[PDB]
Design a protein around this ligand. Structure first.
Ligand SMILES: Nc1ncccc1NCc1cccc(-c2ccc3cc[nH]c3c2)c1
Length: 377
């Protein structure tokens, strides 16, 4: 799958995108890769932030579905017109499929001024598709119409410009070290998993594990942060804060309201502890654990126009909707979305940022009892 290695690009904090073509003749677009949504939606009018947009009028193969979509979210939205057309991935499998496309005709706070992408590829399942679950997501159409195996894998690197690989239809062993360990996909809507234990340097919050997954935990390449429920977030930073004394810095920093700054290269990684999540394993009472470094959750902030220093944002935050294993998590690992077997694979990424000290790890088996009690119902 060397064809596909390095087929993702991005800017720090602006997500990862892949090149796609739509219509006949093919229109090239850059498309955000999003495992936390299930719509394929592309800019189709000259919004000023956009380099490119889908021009349905230039496509023999376009077909109007004569139905609209309206996708609200916090302080923004997009809406568009549904049709279908022929879609392909130049640096992906050598196939063309007819997929649903939401032609985005209006949006607020969706596209990013200065970004190099023009749409979004929702890689999650039908259940959370808009307007409803009869709108077949792209990957379901791909698997259904070709001989591409029902899985994909992501290696998100990054360290302005980020980069990565999306392997469609398989796994590439050059992208990771050691062994893949798999957690079950609890239900096919989001890529929902179950966290059964969290340790913040070697010490668990010793809280009810039902709290780590209230009301969801998910794997989501379209979120930057590790995002933890309040109740867990509280305990979480309470522990990282106390871990990171002999260090010294504010109160709003931890609430992601104010960035922290050191002088070029003076960042003390090591007063911050590693963070380990234990995921339900494939076998009864068996777990495994993934361990991320401060460099994963302390991410460089790009355009600090009022500074020329070494400034980071704390990449953890609270949620009403559950745990979100965003890019902070994913960038330390090769992640296999093994849809065929309803499970997600984690291995140490061949491209993650380590040092000669500590390193992102994937380790098991551990013995963990009553893991199924950690799921919220
Ligand atoms: N992945 C995801 N998680 C939670 C809510 C929505 C969601 N995806 C749909 C969505 C909606 C609005 C904005 C974005 C989005 C815009 C820009 C960027 C840059 C990096 N990631 C994003 C996500 C995604």
């Amino acid at each position: 799958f060397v064809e596909m290695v390095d087929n993702l690009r991005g800017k720090s904090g602006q997500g990862y995108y892949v090149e796609m073509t739509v219509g006949s003749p093919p229109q090239t677009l850059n498309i955000l890769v999003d495992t936390g949504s299930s719509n394929f939606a592309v800019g189709a009018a000259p919004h000023p932030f956009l380099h490119r947009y889908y021009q349905r009028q230039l496509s023999s193969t376009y077909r109007d579905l004569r139905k609209g979509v309206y996708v609200p979210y916090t302080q923004g939205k997009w809406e568009g017109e549904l049709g279908t057309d022929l879609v392909s991935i130049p640096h992906g499998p050598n196939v063309t499929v007819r997929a649903n496309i939401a032609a985005i005709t209006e949006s607020d706070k969706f596209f990013i001024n200065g970004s190099n992408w023009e749409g979004i590829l929702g890689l999650a399942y039908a259940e959370i598709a808009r307007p409803d679950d009869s709108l077949e997501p792209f990957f379901d159409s791909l698997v259904k119409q070709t001989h591409v195996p029902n899985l994909f894998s992501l290696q998100l690197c990054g360290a302005a410009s980020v980069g990565g690989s999306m392997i469609i239809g398989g796994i590439d062993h050059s992208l990771y070290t050691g062994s893949l360990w798999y957690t079950p996909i609890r239900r096919e809507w989001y890529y929902e998993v179950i966290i059964v234990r969290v340790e913040i340097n070697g010490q668990d919050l010793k809280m009810d594990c039902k709290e780590y997954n209230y009301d969801k935990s998910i794997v989501d390449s379209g979120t930057t942060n590790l995002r933890l429920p309040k109740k867990v977030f509280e305990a979480a930073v309470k522990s990282i804060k106390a871990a990171s004394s002999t260090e010294k810095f504010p109160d709003g920093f931890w609430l992601g309201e104010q960035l922290v700054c050191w002088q070029a290269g003076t960042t003390p990684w090591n007063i911050f502890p590693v963070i380990s999540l234990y995921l339900m394993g494939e076998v009864t009472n068996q777990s495994f654990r993934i361990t991320i470094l401060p460099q994963q959750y302390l991410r460089p902030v790009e355009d600090v126009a009022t500074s020329q220093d070494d400034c980071y944002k704390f990449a953890i935050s609270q949620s009403s909707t559950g745990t979100v294993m965003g890019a902070v998590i994913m960038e330390g690992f090769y992640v296999v979305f093994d849809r065929a077997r309803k499970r997600i694979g984690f291995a140490v990424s061949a491209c993650h940022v380590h040092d000669e000290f500590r390193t992102a790890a994937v380790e098991g088996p551990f013995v963990t009892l009553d893991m199924e009690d950690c799921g919220y119902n």
